[PDB]
């Protein structure tokens with residue numbers, strides 16, 4: 716459930732990162748009356764031109780707090796003062812992109828494929844909750860332990876209505892190199908455009924943190940996609956793995972895999988990792 720916190724109960728220790736959304740801190744939560752110190756991440760939101768009423772914020776928080784899955788970062792509490800502060804699970808090892816770049820020489824097929832499974836399970840849960848993420852990338856996956864990762868949201872995720880199949884976005888900055896063509900051209904987002912971004916995220920992992928379409932201007936991306944160019948097969952990937960990824964980047968959104976299928980296929984592979992990824996000195 717949603718805990719409402721007073722300023723007396725938690726403390727920001729240090730900045731972990733920032734962005735348009737605001738700032739995230741490593742923090743400590745000491746709930747009143749209880750006798751425990753809980754390491755947390757505190758996300759303090761940037762002030763908006765038109766701040767929501769507290770009731771609006773609380774309503775969104777309740778829904779957010781109900782997102783309960785092993786592979787999505789949970790909201791534990793909220794403090795509403797002059798700023799909105801969201802108290803969330805701390806992921807001690809940071810984001811997955813930096814983690815795979817810094818530990819590449821010690822990451823094997825088992826870890827990579829398990830991560831693919833976990834991310835797919837978290838995205839499937841989001842889809843079941845009717846949430847379109849809209850910002851899936853290795854940077855937005857966080858590391859609880861080397862064996863356990865969780866997706867999080869920095870503001871772009873959207874709840875779809877019971878009868879809506881798509882989110883139609885407005886203006887602003889978009890992570891072009893992670894987006895499905897239909898999102899780039901028309902600002903349309905669905906669970907299936909999340910699948911496209913999932914594929915790019917997997918490619919990031921399999922290349923140990925290479926930048927997608929390196930050196931290619933974001934403005935030229937939709938053009939090369941229309942020509943049928945995609946991200947290249949990572950050298951460690953077998954054709955079977957690369958084909959799943961390529962399938963995530965079909966032009967036809969409904970020809971892309973569903974996350975439930977991605978869970979199944981990557982679970983099969985994670986069960987015999989060295990068959991599907993070939994990494995020197997893996998064992």
Ligand SMILES: CC(=O)N1CC[C@H](Nc2nc(Nc3ccc(N4CCN(C)CC4)cc3)c3ncn(C(C)C)c3n2)C1
Pocket residue numbers: 731732733734739756757758788803804805806807808809810854855857867869
């Ligand atoms: C804007 C954006 O995409 N980001 C991604 C990370 C950051 N947001 C974040 N970071 C969390 N934890 C964390 C972060 C860096 C470290 N390293 C330890 C190793 N050093 C060499 C460098 C510091 C360690 C832990 C974190 N934990 C939970 N959350 C969410 C749920 C609010 C986090 N967000 C800002």
